[PDB]
Every structure is written in structure tokens, then in C-alpha cells.
Design a protein around this ligand. Structure first.
Ligand SMILES: CCN1CCN(c2ccc(Nc3cc(-c4cccc(-n5ccc6cc(C7CC7)cc(F)c6c5=O)c4CO)cn(C)c3=O)nc2)CC1
Length: 263
């Protein structure tokens, strides 16, 4: 529970699923991002009850939750601040002129954070490049893991909603609402595709509806030009028809480390 007197608001960072997010300072020292939870957007009591668990998720490659301000409205969520923002926009800036080793390192950063979440049996449920952030050192961290459960907007939480992450979802999620560790694995494979394609929309010439059909017929994202056969094999393994044949994040990490040493 952070005291709001210890917070100063400095600049707007943007708008997310819970409304505005600001950059600011905590205890006049520490850079923070501060979510200002838009009223009616969030199942607040549920989030408050379970913010403990999330506060104990602590990994270098997770965007760290520092605290909450819940004795007021709107409530605040205070996190680690990531200078370079959103990985999706970072990818799309041609000026970075990334080496492929840098692209694989971005995959590795994310895999580390997901391997940690997996060990804690904690699902992200919305893993994608838009939900990763980049710090001042070019480190990628996984953001907003687990917060999908508190979203009140039906366009977001429904499979058929205009905001649902259809393109990052396995067939069993879309057809049956079968969520598991393997549905995060699927999304992680799509995320690797986003990275190696420098931020293209997955299934860029299909709608959400056509994408659901395409993947239910056993068809998949093509190899991005920048991806080697071995990088392609890693992402593609994430999209096995049978969820139980997809790798774990621990396996994916050893595969990424292998390609790194090899290529
Ligand atoms: C004038 C240019 N500005 C300065 C440069 N630039 C910039 C630089 C740094 C940053 N850095 C940062 C931006 C955000 C941020 C800002 C606004 C919205 C969201 N966001 C996005 C999606 C989202 C999805 C869910 C789904 C699961 C339900 C739940 C959510 F809560 C959110 C959410 O809040 C975030 C990301 O948290 C968070 N953190 C920590 C940063 O460090 N952001 C932007 C862009 C803006």
C-alpha cells in the first residue's frame, strides 16, 4: 500500500485497458509508471484481493509491480518505469536497424520472464509485443501479466469481442475457452513472429475471423525473412495443434540459448 503523498505526476504515457497511465516520481527519487484506474473499467475488489500474489512476482524480466493506492478513487497501480515504452512501437522504428542477435535477445528476455511465470503457474493471458515494454538499456520486460482477469469491458474479454487477442490465441482458446500454460506458449510463438517481422500484424492480410479459420485448418504464420530455419522451428513448435505437444518455457529457453550459440 503506497501512500499517494509519496507520488508526483509528471507526464502522460498513454491510455491502456484501465485508462490513463502516467510517468512520475515515487519518494522523490524513483521513476515510476502510475496507472490511474478508470472507474467502471476494473473489478477493483478482486484486483485488490489478489494484488498481493502479483506483488510477489519478482523477476528481472517482469515489469515489477511496486504497490497500489486503494484508499481513494480512482485507485492507482504503481510499477517499474520503462523508458523506451512498448515493444510493438519499438520494433516498428526502422532507425534501430536491429541485428538478428538483438531480435533473438528480445525473445530470450521475454522467454525468461514467461519461464518464471510458468514456474509460479501463473498465466499472462494476453502475451504479445504490445504487452511488453523496453527499458533504457534495451531490455525487454513482460507487462500487465494476469490483469486481464479484472477487465470489465466485454469487447476485450469475449472471444468474439473487437478487442480480444484473437491473433495471439490458440484454437482451443477460441473454440472452447481452454486456457492453460500452453495458450501462453502459443502467444509467445506469435510474439517471436512479431519480433522477427519487425512489428507486422500477425496474419496481416486476414481478419480476426479468417485467422480463427486458418489456424483451425492447421495452417500457420510464414517464416519472417529475418528468421533462420532454426528460429522458425522454435516459434512454430509453439503452434502445435495439440496443446500438450507444445514445449514449456523452460524448453523454449534452452532452444533460444542453442540458436544463440549456433548462429
Ligand atoms: C509523447 C510521447 N510519450 C513519451 C514516450 N512514449 C513512452 C515512453 C515510455 C513508456 N513507458 C510505459 C508505458 C506504460 C503504459 C502506458 C499506457 C497504457 C499501458 N497499458 C497498455 C496495455 C494494457 C493492457 C492490459 C490488459 C491485460 C488487461 C492492461 C493494462 F493496464 C494496460 C496498460 O496499462 C501501459 C503498459 O502498462 C507502462 N509502463 C510501465 C511504462 O513504463 N510509455 C510511453 C510514448 C508517449
Amino acid at each position: 500500500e503506497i501512500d499517494p503523498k509519496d507520488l508526483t505526476f509528471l507526464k502522460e504515457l498513454g491510455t491502456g485497458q484501465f485508462g490513463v497511465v502516467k510517468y512520475g516520481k515515487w519518494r522523490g527519487q524513483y521513476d515510476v509508471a502510475i496507472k490511474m484506474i478508470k472507474e467502471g473499467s476494473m473489478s477493483e475488489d478482486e484486483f485488490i484481493e489478489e494484488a498481493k500474489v502479483m506483488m510477489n512476482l519478482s523477476h528481472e524480466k517482469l515489469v515489477q509491480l511496486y504497490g497500489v493506492c486503494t484508499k481513494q478513487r480512482p485507485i492507482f497501480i504503481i510499477t517499474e518505469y520503462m523508458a523506451n515504452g512498448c515493444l510493438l512501437n519499438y520494433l516498428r522504428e526502422a532507425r534501430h536497424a536491429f541485428q538478428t542477435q538483438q531480435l533473438l535477445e528480445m525473445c530470450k528476455d521475454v522467454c525468461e520472464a514467461m519461464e518464471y511465470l510458468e514456474s509460479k503457474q501463473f498465466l499472462h493471458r494476453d502475451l504479445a509485443a504490445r504487452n511488453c515494454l523496453v527499458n533504457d538499456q534495451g531490455v525487454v520486460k513482460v507487462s500487465d501479466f494476469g490483469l486481464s482477469r479484472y477487465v470489465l469491458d466485454d469487447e476485450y474479454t469475449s472471444s468474439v469481442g473487437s478487442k480480444f487477442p484473437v491473433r495471439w490465441s490458440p484454437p482451443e482458446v477460441l473454440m472452447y475457452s481452454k486456457f492453460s500454460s500452453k495458450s501462453d506458449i502459443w502467444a509467445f510463438g506469435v510474439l517471436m513472429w512479431e519480433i522477427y517481422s519487425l512489428g507486422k500484424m500477425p496474419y496481416e492480410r486476414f481478419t480476426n475471423s479468417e485467422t480463427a479459420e486458418h489456424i483451425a485448418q492447421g495452417l500457420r504464420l510464414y517464416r519472417p525473412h529475418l528468421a533462420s530455419a532454426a528460429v522458425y522451428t522454435i516459434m512454430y513448435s509453439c503452434w502445435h495443434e495439440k496443446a500438450d505437444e507444445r514445449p514449456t518455457f523452460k524448453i523454449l529457453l534452452s532452444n533460444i540459448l542453442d540458436v544463440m550459440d549456433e548462429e
